Amino acid sequence: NPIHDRTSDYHKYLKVKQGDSDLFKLTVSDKRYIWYNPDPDERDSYECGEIVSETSDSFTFKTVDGQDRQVKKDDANQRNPIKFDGVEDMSELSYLNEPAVFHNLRVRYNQDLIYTYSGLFLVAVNPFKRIPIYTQEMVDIFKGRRRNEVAPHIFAISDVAYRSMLDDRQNQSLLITGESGAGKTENTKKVIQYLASVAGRNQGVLEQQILQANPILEAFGNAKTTRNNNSSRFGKFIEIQFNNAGFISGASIQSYLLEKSRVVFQSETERNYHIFYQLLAGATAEEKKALHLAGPESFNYLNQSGCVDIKGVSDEDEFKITRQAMDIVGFSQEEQMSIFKIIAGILHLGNIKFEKGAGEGAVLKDKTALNAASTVFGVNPSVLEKALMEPRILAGRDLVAQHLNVEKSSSSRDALVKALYGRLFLWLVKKINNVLCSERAAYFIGVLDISGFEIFKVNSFEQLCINYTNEKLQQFFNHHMFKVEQEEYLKEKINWTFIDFGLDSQATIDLIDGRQPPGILALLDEQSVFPNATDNTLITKLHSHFSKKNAKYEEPRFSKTEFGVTHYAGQVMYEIQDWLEKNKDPLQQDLELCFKDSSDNVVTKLFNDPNIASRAKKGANFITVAAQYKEQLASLMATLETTNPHFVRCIIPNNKQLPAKLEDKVVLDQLRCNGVLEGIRITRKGFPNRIIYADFVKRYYLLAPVPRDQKATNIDPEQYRFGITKIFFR
Numbered sequence: 039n040p041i042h043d044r045t046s047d048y049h050k051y052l053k054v055k056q057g058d059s060d061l062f063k064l065t066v067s068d069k070r071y072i073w074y075n076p077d078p079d080e081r082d083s084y085e086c087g088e089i090v091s092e093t094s095d096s097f098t099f100k101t102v103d104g105q106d107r108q109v110k111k112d113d114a115n116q117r118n119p120i121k122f123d124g125v126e127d128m129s130e131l132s133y134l135n136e137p138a139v140f141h142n143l144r145v146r147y148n149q150d151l152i153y154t155y156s157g158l159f160l161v162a163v164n165p166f167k168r169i170p171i172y173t174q175e176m177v178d179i180f181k182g183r184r185r186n187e188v189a190p191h192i193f194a195i196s197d198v199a200y201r202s203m204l205d206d207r208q209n210q211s212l213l214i215t216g217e218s219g220a221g222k223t224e225n226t227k228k229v230i231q232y233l234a235s236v237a238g239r240n241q242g243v244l245e246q247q248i249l250q251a252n253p254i255l256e257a258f259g260n261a262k263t264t265r266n267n268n269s270s271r272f273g274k275f276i277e278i279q280f281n282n283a284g285f286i287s288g289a290s291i292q293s294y295l296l297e298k299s300r301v302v303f304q305s306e307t308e309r310n311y312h313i314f315y316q317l318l319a320g321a322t323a324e325e326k327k328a329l330h331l332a333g334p335e336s337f338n339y340l341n342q343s344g345c346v347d348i349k350g351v352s353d354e355d356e357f358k359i360t361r362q363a364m365d366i367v368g369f370s371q372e373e374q375m376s377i378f379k380i381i382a383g384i385l386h387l388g389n390i391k392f393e394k395g396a397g398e399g400a401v402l403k404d405k406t407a408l409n410a411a412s413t414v415f416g417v418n419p420s421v422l423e424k425a426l427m428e429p430r431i432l433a434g435r436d437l438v439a440q441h442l443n444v445e446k447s448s449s450s451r452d453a454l455v456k457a458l459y460g461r462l463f464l465w466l467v468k469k470i471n472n473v474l475c476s477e478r479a480a481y482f483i484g485v486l487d488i489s490g491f492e493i494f495k496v497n498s499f500e501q502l503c504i505n506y507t508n509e510k511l512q513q514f515f516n517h518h519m520f521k522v523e524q525e526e527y528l529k530e531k532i533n534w535t536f537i538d539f540g541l542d543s544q545a546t547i548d549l550i551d552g553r554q555p556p557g558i559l560a561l562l563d564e565q566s567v568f569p570n571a572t573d574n575t576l577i578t579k580l581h582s583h584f585s586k587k588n589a590k591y592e593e594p595r596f597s598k599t600e601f602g603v604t605h606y607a608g609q610v611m612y613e614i615q616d617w618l619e620k621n622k623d624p625l626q627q628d629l630e631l632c633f634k635d636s637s638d639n640v641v642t643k644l645f646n647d648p649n650i651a652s653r654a655k656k657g658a659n660f661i662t663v664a665a666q667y668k669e670q671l672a673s674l675m676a677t678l679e680t681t682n683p684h685f686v687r688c689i690i691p692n693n694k695q696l697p698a699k700l701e702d703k704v705v706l707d708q709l710r711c712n713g714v715l716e717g718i719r720i721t722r723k724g725f726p727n728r729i730i731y732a733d734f735v736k737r738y739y740l741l742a743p744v745p746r747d748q749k750a751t752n753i754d755p756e757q758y759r760f761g762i763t764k765i766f767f768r
């Protein structure tokens with residue numbers, strides 16, 4: 039038993055190293071310590087000091103340098119006894135304080151132990167390096183073990199969810215939180231791997247396909263951002279489905295909010311979606327020929343950030359992986375080819391150069407890019423050109439051709455690319471889901487991997503929707519961990535004295551998505567269907583409604599085009615530029631007519647399938663992006679509310695994507711804003727386990743002298759409470 043064998047990889051990689059003679063000595067010391075701030079300005083940088091004296095209300099301690107300091111016992115952050123250093127469950131700590139919590143995570147991190155329990159949920163600190171803890175052998179160990187019998191691991195939280203599914207015959211969810219680059223997506227992948235393994239029908243196809251969906255989605259939905267070289271630029275809710283038996287019956291992926299604008303624009307040093315680089319790199323010369331491709335430097339859509347490659351990554355090699363995945367998922371050779379033609383057409387489109395013509399309306403002097411694109415997409419070039427520069431619209435009922443200028447024509451070509459891309463993405467997912475749909479699921483374990491909280495020099499509409507989503511997910515944790523928990527206690531009249539954990543994202547949530555009074559999204563929507571609205575009228579309106587009126591909102595004095603929102607993770611300044619267009623998400627209809635006529639089977643679907651091509655209508659207008667997403671999100675949350683949730687809090691160690699470099703301020707801000715300590719305090723202070731008397735009696739009347747057919751209901755009364763319908767236990 040590797041679990042017992044100090045020589046096992048399990049022991050080696052998942053357990054705290056045996057401390058030494060000396061350590062033993064320090065461990066038995068009678069000395070007492072405190073965590074303190076050598077510099078009170080830097081409240082997150084602590085030192086260890088020996089408590090030398092004490093009064094009824096204070097502690098006197100020595101500082102590093104050796105000097106002595108005094109503190110109210112009240113404000114003291116006592117250091118836990120060293121035997122606690124590296125503890126698997128921080129709820130065991132005697133002293134629950136910031137520096138102590140960070141310390142324990144630091145101890146574990148320093149020996150490559152990235153997983154640590156915080157009471158009922160898991161904390162995962164990104165290592166920024168490979169740790170061999172995810173092998174089959176590793177998986178095998180977790181298999182069916184109680185959380186308590188094994189070390190903290192994403193596999194273990196996965197097993198528990200799985201057991202709870204089968205035990206309670208209830209659906210579950212694995213909610214993995216974190217800011218951008220925290221490790222949500224790596225963890226998610228581990229969750230899937232585990233489930234596939236432990237509930238996989240052995241004798242691995244459905245299962246491998248489930249697995250294989252991954253690289254396809256990431257090649258098309260991930261990109262290098264300044265915070266993450268493999269940033270998920272869309273969110274996903276993966277439903278792992280199981281039959282009555284507990285075997286994996288299927289899976290389903292729901293995608294959210296693809297950052298379509300990345301296809302046409304990328305900030306300095308970032309990348310466009312990986313796929314673009316994989317194709318250019320992994321394409322054959324025969325393919326490169328037929329697609330009229332060159333290197334990324336030859337394309338405006340890939341040659342503006344200053345970055346075409348990611349250290350340690352081989353686009354050409356990933357291309358092969360993407361392709362095999364498509365192969366395993368089942369995409370036909372023809373399908374794949376159309377897929378690449380679409381990518382290639384996008385690239386050429388991007389190369390179209392509009393020029394001012396006669397007067398205002400634009401002209402296209404060189405048709406190379408235009409012809410190349412038309413040729414790969416299987417659409418008519420003149421038709422496409424007219425659709426770009428002179429699209430037709432109704433003026434009342436009259437039909438008028440517009441004559442767009444250089445700026446509008448480019449924006450339109452951009453809009454066409456974005457729709458091509460977003461719809462291709464949706465098609466890839468739908469294609470994947472259809473392959474994976476083969477059973478009327480008895481249960482599911484849903485894994486949520488969203489784009490996490492992010493802040494850039496320029497935060498736009500995409501950032502707002504992302505951060506809003508992260509704010510809602512945090513609220514869901516708050517709700518679950520504290521709101522609902524206490525209500526049960528209070529409900530069951532167990533004499534719980536309500537505690538205010540001080541964590542509440544409601545006000546921020548409301549500021550954003552409130553109806554009445556209207557929040558930011560409501561106002562954006564109103565202005566969005568207002569004929570004379572401009573980004574300027576929009577911002578003015580936001581300010582008029584929230585400036586000096588909403589606590590979570592700020593109208594900055596240093597800018598006229600930005601507004602600030604105070605999220606759980608920090609305040610973010612948003613630039614209003616393009617918001618109406620972004621919310622409206624327009625696309626000239628003549629563009630769509632051009633594409634519905636494509637000789638390409640895939641292109642056709644993107645434009646002809648109402649599942650992909652159709653826009654929903656809200657009265658006299660089509661639905662906006664905001665309303666639409668707000669709705670998707672609300673629906674997600676409702677679904678989650680029907681599951682038994684398990685939280686994984688991913689923690690980023692620093693902002694450099696470096697291993698072995700745990701930054702205290704970095705980590706502490708996350709622990710603070712995620713509600714980690716409060717969450718530990720609740721686990722401690724309260725009563726996790728509870729059972730209705732009758733299901734308790736019925737279940738086991740056997741330990742009894744007691745019938746099977748409440749009050750009657752030895753074991754110690756310290757760890758138990760008597761509720762009004764159930765009894766509670768620790």
Ligand SMILES: Nc1ncnc2c1ncn2[C@@H]1O[C@H](COP(=O)(O)OP(=O)(O)O)[C@@H](O)[C@H]1O
Nearest residue numbers: 164166167168218219220221222223224266268
């Ligand atoms: N458990 C882990 N093991 C190894 N590397 C990891 C782990 N978790 C995260 N990483 C590293 O951090 C990077 C960002 O992680 P990721 O899951 O993509 O973040 P996000 O939370 O943004 O999804 C990964 O590409 C990988 O380099």
Ligand code: VO4
Nearest residue numbers: 218219270489490
């Ligand atoms: O960087 V991530 O949080 O996958 O968008």
Ligand SMILES: [Mg+2]
Nearest residue numbers: 222223269270
């Ligand atoms: Mg991710």
